[PDB]
Amino acid sequence: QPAHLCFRSFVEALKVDNDLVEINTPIDPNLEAAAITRRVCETNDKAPLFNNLIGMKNGLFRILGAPGSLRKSSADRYGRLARHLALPPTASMREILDKMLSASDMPPIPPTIVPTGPCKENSLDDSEFDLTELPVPLIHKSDGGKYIQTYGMHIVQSPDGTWTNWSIARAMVHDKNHLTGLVIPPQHIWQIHQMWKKEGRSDVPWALAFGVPPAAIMASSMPIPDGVTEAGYVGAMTGSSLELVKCDTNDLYVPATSEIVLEGTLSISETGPEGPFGEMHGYIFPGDTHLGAKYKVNRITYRNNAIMPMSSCGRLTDETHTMIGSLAAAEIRKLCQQNDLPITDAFAPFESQVTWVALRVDTEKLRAMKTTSEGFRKRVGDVVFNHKAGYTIHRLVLVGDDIDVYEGKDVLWAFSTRCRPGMDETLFEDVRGFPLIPYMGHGNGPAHRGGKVVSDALMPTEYTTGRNWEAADFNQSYPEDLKQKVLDNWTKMGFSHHHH
Amino acid sequence: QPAHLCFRSFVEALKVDNDLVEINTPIDPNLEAAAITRRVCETNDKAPLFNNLIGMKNGLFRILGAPGSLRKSSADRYGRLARHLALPPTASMREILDKMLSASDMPPIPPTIVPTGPCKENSLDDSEFDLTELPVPLIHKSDGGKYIQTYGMHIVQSPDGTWTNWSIARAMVHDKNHLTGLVIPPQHIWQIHQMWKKEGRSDVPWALAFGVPPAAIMASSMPIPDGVTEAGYVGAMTGSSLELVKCDTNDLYVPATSEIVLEGTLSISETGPEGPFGEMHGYIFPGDTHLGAKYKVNRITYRNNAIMPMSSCGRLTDETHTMIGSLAAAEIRKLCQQNDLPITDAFAPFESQVTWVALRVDTEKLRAMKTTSEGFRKRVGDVVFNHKAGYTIHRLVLVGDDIDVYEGKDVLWAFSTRCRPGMDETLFEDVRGFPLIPYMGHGNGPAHRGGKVVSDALMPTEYTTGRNWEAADFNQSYPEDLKQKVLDNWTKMGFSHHHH
Ligand SMILES: CC1=C(C(=O)O)[C@@H]2CC(C)(C)c3c(C)c(C)cc4c3N2[C@@]12C(=O)NC(=O)N=C2N4C[C@H](O)[C@H](O)[C@H](O)COP(=O)(O)O
Ligand SMILES: CC1=C(C(=O)O)[C@@H]2CC(C)(C)c3c(C)c(C)cc4c3N2[C@@]12C(=O)NC(=O)N=C2N4C[C@H](O)[C@H](O)[C@H](O)COP(=O)(O)O
Ligand SMILES: [K+]
Ligand SMILES: [K+]
Ligand SMILES: [K+]
Ligand SMILES: [K+]
Ligand SMILES: [Mn+2]
Ligand SMILES: [Mn+2]
């Protein structure tokens, strides 16, 4: 099975890429696995595969950390993400995001039901498992529970059957047969949960599949539109119908090659303590426990020698930055274009802790609009901040065509030098806010509202007659022939490889 | 003579440090020298010494580029600045800024007059030189003149004789015996010029000394207080009285070992075209010429084999960032402390194009003040933005004690995650603005007023009961013994030097 369609194959691909360290000595799921993974993520090292996890029994489970984190070299920086998608390991961010958007004007390719798959190699009923007895990791020392779920996909379906959503949302072990987790607006798991609650008749049929096809976990992390079944989107993106098997205890369908599957229900009535957790913005607030959604597990099925993927999230750089930020930015780019805004590119700078998105503007198109900064900022902010794809993003930075938004140094340069604080900005207080940002949920204002801004780093003539400067840099401040001469004589003179 | 007291010795020190490339083949002052220097600055390479400058005649002149720029290694990143000050090459920024502040509560050590020095080895009178015939560099392709003056020190004295100021301000060749340059409020050269203009009797006696003692050029770049003679400040900082020689044609005094000295007058009546220039924020606006101050040169004196230092300024990283930003930040730190504000450290992040200063707060002291963000932001902004030391700085970022303000990644993290846009900020429109920032002079609002902000990245409990989070990082999210175990086993497991 190809790497993008089968997690086990993906692990092999990371090995073959010399992007994996197999650790075959005993490693403690209580902090040690996550500490190693955290160090990996902070240093862009090889992904760790913990084959000898203390507490592993009857095949449950090995751990792969850092599945979507960065590689050290520039040339294959995003290679792990490329390996989720059948792209060359040298693929650019633009190419990765274009691949993730490609299915947006394609017909869905619905999944194919098959009678069995590797995820059915082992099972444990309601009398055979205990979630507290599995080697579930404690990821950060102050976490309020052992977070089994950092890189699996929740599967829930609308009551009417017409939409099946796949998404990543955290969850931790509550007791032998329950999890608690985040289920918050405007997320699709929340939207579907609300439908079931308003119907009022039953708990939500649910499955949580770990070690799913990599292409599927990428879509699970992306805010594709309301009502769109991720499986068909992934089918279209990959050009292949995904093979799914029915759950044993409900009529949901899971990827055939899933490493581990939990089957059960998401309660429409019950809650339990959830969090705190060391989160994407780099913080944990110890003791901040709150009631979360409560999941009941009825059955576990799993592959022989099952592998659980894990995100040891926090400070830069991990899946919560590479995937949440970049994939939100991708959807925002498309949303802007669909609203007739002249946006060519979007990226969430890592430097902003993926709380900003930089929007590259086609300034020829902007000039033809014959508009102003005030007007344009308002229009862009209304489009983005009123939409779910803008949920996690609190600052939009508009930049002209000279800026590569995938290069944080250049975004910061433009922001710092082209956007006059206050005057060149529009604040948005009457929009949904992202409470997990510390300045929101632990800040001075409403946790769930406001705190958003559009910062216009377009210069005045970019709206009128065209850019009126040159950069004071090597590239722009010297003629071509001179630059080439300098380059050609550089080592000869005495001054100081692409792959590395 | 020590390196910090004699530019020629400083050049030797850079050689000995393996931080110099001598280029002994012909190099064109028309763009080529500056292009090489620009490349050096963008890549943190060795400083270039152009010993064979096309147009050099009768000893005028060689060029040293990048005198205060960065070295590639982390361990001696700021070594060129350390070499200006007799500090070890491994000195931290904190140590460099403390050295630059040390003279602020010391008695001045006034200079010593000596009868001659190396700067008198050669001379050219009013009938022997022509500034248009010297190998003055064209630094950026669109510059409005050949900028002879990027790293010399202007010397002007108050009419009453009581204050002699040393400062860096740019100047370009106007004709055979005149320069034009920037002389703008609130700078000390401008303040002194105004005194002479109000007296109305004569042009300002002036000298411009190039290749001065390194310790002197550092003070020349620092906003030490009004009325304070830089020579005595440098004397106190270095513990040594600086040796000065009288000019031939006026009664000003120049460093004995100056490489090149221009003597003349700064007009109280005449102006001439000045600029545009590729400036510190990374831009040039071609054709933006404006009237500047006009200097008449009456005499040149110089060392045998004189060396002209040059800053090829623009995009990161050069003297305009390392010196302007850091030294303003130093003075701001002191100013805040003198105003009873609990600031421990200040730095202008390079990422902000040195337009921000991050202020590290002693939050134990803050808590004892029993204040609020609104109140504290206003107080800090009033102190800084109403003072000359705040002139160049448009955003102040307040951070708590966990943040190392000398580390831009950490400042950006704190800014992005702890300061709610709008609500946690105070805008200042009725303060002097820095027009050279593009969003000021080429922006949507008044070039000279406003556009400043205090951004509070202190979290709420930092004002009350104390920090209430731990970072979700390797350092803070795992116990000591586990961290050390991970580190000790890191290479054994299969994962990846301080000097490099
Ligand atoms: C914000 C999130 C997390 C957190 O920071 O704690 C937490 C951490 C983990 C689990 C590691 C994590 C990883 C590793 C990745 C890659 C993404 C997320 C998360 N977690 C959170 C969460 O628990 N709640 C949430 O609101 N969305 C999260 N996403 C992002 C969502 O997947 C994304 O917004 C999708 O678009 C949602 O799908 P649809 O609803 O559009 O179908
Ligand atoms: C802003 C400046 C420049 C510019 O960007 O064009 C220009 C570029 C050069 C010459 C390379 C340059 C270098 C290489 C360095 C290291 C510093 C400066 C400059 N230039 C400018 C300038 O021409 N006008 C100005 O307002 N101040 C400048 N400084 C900073 C001042 O020296 C500083 O503010 C001092 O505090 C002033 O001394 P006092 O008045 O307090 O005594
Ligand atoms: K999704
Ligand atoms: K702007
Ligand atoms: K000065
Ligand atoms: K704050
Ligand atoms: Mn969805
Ligand atoms: Mn001064």
A139: annotated binding-site residue? Answer: no
Q: Give alpha helix (H) positions in A102-229.
A: 188-199, 214-220
DSSP string of B86-151, one letter each residue:
T--TT--HHHHHHHHHGGGGS-----EE-S--GGGSEEE-TTT--GGGS-PPB-STT-SS---BSS
C-beta of residue A461 within 8 angstroms of C-beta of residue B444: no
Interface probe for B, chosen from A141, A416, A452, A464 (most Cβ of B below 10 Å), is: A416
Across the strands, what pairs with A300? A124, A262
Distance to chain A for B290, nearest Cα, Å: 16
Cβ neighbours, 10 Å, residue B268: 18
CA of B373 to the centre of ligand 6 (A): 7
Residue B351: which of A291, A225, A67, A408 has the closest Cα? A408
Determine the longest span between alpha carbons in chain A, in angstroms.
80
Is A24's Cβ below 8 Å from some Cβ in B? Answer: no
- On whether the CB atoms of residues B383 and B335 are closer than 8 A, the answer is yes
Residue B319's closest CA among B220, B413, B448, B412?
A: B220
Entry field: residues in chain A: 500
**Cβ-based contacts of A450 with chain B (< 8 Å):** 422-423
A-B contacts at Cβ under 8 angstroms:
278
Most B CBs within 10 Å, among A139, A420, A437, A449, to test the B interface: A420
Q: Is A298 helix (H, G, I), strand (E, B) or coil?
A: strand
List, in order, residues 6 or more apart from B62 with CB less than 8 Å away.
B49, B50, B51, B53, B56, B305, B306, B307, B308
The torsion defined by the Cα of B98, B99, B100 and B104, in degrees rounded to 10, comes to: 80
Method used for this model?
X-ray
With contact defined as beta carbons under 8 Å apart, do B305 and B321 qualify? no
A314: helix, strand or coil: coil
Strand, coil or helix: A146: coil
* A394: Cα within 13 Å, side-chain hemisphere: 29
CB A306 within 8 A of CB A266: no
* Distances, alpha carbon A104 to alpha carbons A95, B12, B372, in Å: 15, 63, 48
**Contact indicator for A499, A75 with CB cutoff of 8 Å:** yes
User: Strand order in A112-113's β-sheet?
Assistant: A112-113, A243-246, A253-255
Looking at the DSSP assignment, which residues form a beta bridge with residue B455?
B397, B425
Question: Taking Cα atoms as reference points, which of A246, A254, A64 lies closest to residue A166?
Answer: A254
Nearest to B280 by CA among B392, B188, B448: B392
Chain B residue nearest residue A470, CA to CA: B284
Expressed in Å, this structure's resolution amounts to: 1.0
- The tokens describing A89, both together, are 């390991």
SS3 content of chain B, % helix, strand, coil (to 5): 30, 25, 45
Give the type of residue at A98: D
- Beta strands B395-399; B356-361: pairing state: parallel
CA distances from residue B388 to A52, A162, B187, B378, B391 in whole angstroms, order as listed: 63, 66, 8, 17, 5
A150 HSE (CA, 13 A, CB side) = 32
- Report d(CA A345, CA A332) in Å as an integer: 9
Question: Is residue B266 within a helix (H) or strand (E), and if so which, with residue range?
Answer: strand B260-274
**Cβ–Cβ < 8 Å for A301, A263:** yes
Distance (Å, whole) CA A309 – CA A259: 9
Q: Please, are residues B295 and B264 in contact by the beta-carbon 8 Å criterion? A: yes
Whether residue A390 has its Cβ less than 6 Å from ligand 1: no
Distances (CA, A) of A383 to A102, A175, B162: 21, 43, 62
Beta-carbon contacts of residue B301 (< 8 Å; ≥ 6 apart): B119, B120, B121, B122, B123, B124, B248, B260, B261, B263
What are the residue numbers of the active site of A?
279
The answer to whether residues B41 and B318 touch, using CB atoms and an 8 Å cutoff, is: yes
Q: Angle B275-B254-B125 (CA atoms, 0-180°, nearest 5)?
A: 70
Q: Is B51 exposed, middle or buried (0-12, 13-18, 19+ CB in 10 A)?
A: middle
- The residues that bridge with B123 in the sheet, in sequence order, are B301
Contact B81, B322 (CB under 8 A): yes
Counted residue by residue, chain B has a size of: 500
Would you call A443 helix, strand, or coil by DSSP? coil
Rounded alpha-carbon distances, angstroms, from residue A195 to A301, A331, A350, B304 = 28, 25, 35, 87
Our CA-based measurement puts residue A310 at a distance from the nearest CA of chain B, in whole angstroms, of 15
> What's the token pair of residue B212?
């001065």
Residues 278-297 of B with CB under 8 A from A: 278-279, 281-286
